[PDB]
Amino acid sequence: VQATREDKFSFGLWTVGWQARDAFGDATRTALDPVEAVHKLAEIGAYGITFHDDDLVPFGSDAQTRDGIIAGFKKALDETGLIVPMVTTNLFTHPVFKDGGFTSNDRSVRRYAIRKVLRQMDLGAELGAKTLVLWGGREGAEYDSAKDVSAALDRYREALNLLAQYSEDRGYGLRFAIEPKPNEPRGDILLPTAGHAIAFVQELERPELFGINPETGHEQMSNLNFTQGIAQALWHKKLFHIDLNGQHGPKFDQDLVFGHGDLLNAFSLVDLLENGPDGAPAYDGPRNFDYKPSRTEDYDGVWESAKANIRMYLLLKERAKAFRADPEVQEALAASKVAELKTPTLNPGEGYAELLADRSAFEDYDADAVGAKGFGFVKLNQLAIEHLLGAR
Template identity: 30%
Template sequence: MSSTFHVGQREYFPGIGAIPFEGRESDNPLAFKVYDAQRQIGGRSMAEHLRFAVAYWHSFCGTGQDPFGPGTRMYPWDQGSSALARAEAKADAAFEFITKLGVPYYCFHDVDLAPDADDIGQYRDNLAHMVTVAGRLQQQTGVKLLWGTANLFSHPRYMNGAATNPDFAVVARAAVQVRAALDATVALGGQNYVFWGGREGYACLLNTDMKREQAHLARFLAAARDYGRSIGFTGTFLIEPKPMEPMHHQYDFDSATVVGFLRAHGLDGDFKLNIEANHATLSGHSFAHDLQVAADAGLLGSIDANRGNPQNGWDTDQFPTDLYDTVGAMLVVLRSGGFGHGGLNFDAKVRRESTDPQDLFMAHIGGMDAFARGLEVAHALIERSPLEGWRAERYASFDSGAGAAFARGELGLEALCEHALVAGEPTVRSGRQEAYENLLNQYLLR
């Protein structure tokens, strides 16, 4: 990937060059302290392990607005005379930022990349034009598309959902965007396609036929899959769980709910999960829990890397800086064999009060360093610490004898009872939680 960006356009982040790796002793806020893209860990480079991606929507579209006030950031790429001119300038700014940061991938919604339009023909023309622009920029910079998706939640037509909307006309209109976004993803070489059902749920159960809506959602996903395969999409379709907000209850509540839904409708052969940290905590789980559920089902696809504020009950989408979270996440990823087509997309936004251009760089640098350190520690815990041995020993009674027979399904309830009569009262065995936590700290502090 090129670390410079010179195609004759305006420089949108002047004074900031390619972000260097300077190591732990550096005090430079615009340098990596841990993330060294080419450093080898377990036979792969950090870049290959982590597969970082920049979120187009938060980083180049979000102005800092919240329910209590308008945006606080005025972007220089939003000053063009027409919507398409502004979209082109935004793309130039995005690829300048991504290349200076040294990130290999990006992600987008259709109407992040191109201007939206109620007229279907105009919408398609806008997106096709911007796909051409993005394709040229990808070729010039070497940046790749991790995944594409369609925004089926912002427009008022989707206030009652998209694929689950009680009005068939809305379902059909949603298909227009999904088809166009799939076309764009294939044209740009996207490795995944994501469905986030932001309004696929209900606000009031009294007026909702939940069984019917979920059946329609499954039919819609199957139709999208079939179309994607027909145009040559060979990547992974991803579902992103979230429990609520904006809806009272969303059908993709958490990892376990989505796994069950995919299996119930025969979609688990093509679909996996895109886990977001903040969504996991909103569902009452830890980030690592939802990752582990997906991994245990063989359906862990990709990660939206962020965090929430534990004092807030909504989706704050803060950049990830909690090392315990990143270690826990990378333990799951490494044990499951790595990302495959997926990666770590920073679905995170700088704070409303952060208004300088360098703030966006520093936010990403901090998140990348946090996950790089998580990778280092997780790899060391697996390869050099007693952690895996401790975990195996805790379940050793199922590795031989009657315990192994039970695990193979060879012992019924009567046989279990007979074993208990012979064995007598079980010995109390400590879970040693403190030892595990101290071991993690020991390796984190090295």
């Protein structure tokens, strides 16, 4: 397979552009020119690109410099036909953000953070972005007493309400997606899982403008089931965006190519996204790859790794399709009663009164006999893996 713009594969400028300076060593690669990055991505099939303000414009560029950069950027976008679906702001690199942006203990830092974001919203709106992604990487703590969480969530909410206001007033029409992460770089990060971020969003002034941008590895850093969490995000209708990558459980942030960590979970994720209700995908935003080319690689390895993300997604998609169209899989699903979960437990018009009255629901229920019937879940799981292995 080959990707089409229909696939909606995007990459962050900072993925293919990571110079591979890790916590223990120097960069192994030279910087990638953003224009060059646009051309290369277009060429591999990406439909869009995303970036943090500071990825494009060096922190502290004068207006002439910044203006020049933006202009060339837009020219490259025009020429390749790539779009900018989302934009984001770097609130974690500069020493000033060492205790966070929106929730730094220092009031002046909080005011500055908001201004940095507003400035990025303007640039996003001008490039046509539809969503503003917010990754509060420095919002959190290494020690429990250093941060008042309640005060922190109030401050977080306070900054976000202002951003929605500004957008709505300017008629920018942006949506906002909060990106959860459990830890790294802070010992513990606020809004640690997709669950925590959805519950928070529900407390904003204009909740309908807010959703989440969950990332594969972030949920796997807590050993959570990524597909299962995505399923819940879809049930809430809060999956505004998605970051795809690979990770090997609880350890530092690996940012591997999507599919290179937990393959089986990658497989069920692609099944959930594409084999949505009514034939169609359950999700229609960008399929964003938020990964990093391993430090052992050079620029050839960088493009290889970019192509690997798309290949991995398309291969899994193919196998998910085949899986569902297999009459033996259907038979297994029927035997496992997967679809029976979709039928209400209560009959149409039945309330507690009638249920209470139904002797077959309690008084005459043979718990023991039902408890002895197998669900055939293992056999179903085996068919799924055989499809993934191209054995069926």
